[PDB]
Amino acid sequence: KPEPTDEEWELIKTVTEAHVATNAQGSHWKQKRKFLPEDIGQAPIKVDLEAFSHFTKIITPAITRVVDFAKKLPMFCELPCEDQIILLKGCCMEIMSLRAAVRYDPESETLTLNGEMAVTRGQLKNGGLGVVSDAIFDLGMSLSSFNLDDTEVALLQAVLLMSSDRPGLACVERIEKYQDSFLLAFEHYINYRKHHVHFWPKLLMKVTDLRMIGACHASWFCPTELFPPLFLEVF
């Protein structure tokens, strides 16, 4: 089946490099990482506030990394500033969920946030996520058969960023062309990569899985001063 054309290799390299440059604690993440003390994040008898205090502490550096990723894509950088904002409020949760889920550790049953905080499913649920925690932990459990490398995670992140779907976009058509460049280059890479899994229809279902994870901004949402202001801006 068709493999990347020369312009898509250029594309793949650029997107991949954007991702490695912005992934927290890069390759050390499983060594720098520390497990949240397990007294934190138990069932209240609403929301545990101590778990919640830690998650607002790391949300802002995490949102920031996603912004660093899109700004390393020439395709994103030539959009009007208003469009980049709309695109960025729409994919931020999605992309952070993806990067947390590729950092699933079954020996521990934890995802790693910011390259340093290993968190169990119960901690993340009781810190405020609720059912969205089970959603993210399901993605990471199901992704371990897919064996995604840096470029596949990077192209995923590119498909989610370039969503002409989001409301308020001036350059809807332009945004739809960039995503098709990525979508094509992603498949051609999947072909060449020859995963031993009906790979690609399944991967497209995982994209939907993330968009659902993203569409729960409102079914997620403690006083508003308790949220970091950068978090308030993208939710």
Binding site: T64, V67, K71, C81, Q84, I85, L88, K89, P229, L230, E233, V234
Partner: peptide, 11 residues
């Protein structure tokens, strides 16, 4: 709105 997200984009 979005006064800080705007700043990070033009940084």
């Amino acid at each position: 709105e979005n006064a800080l997200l705007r700043y990070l984009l033009d940084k």
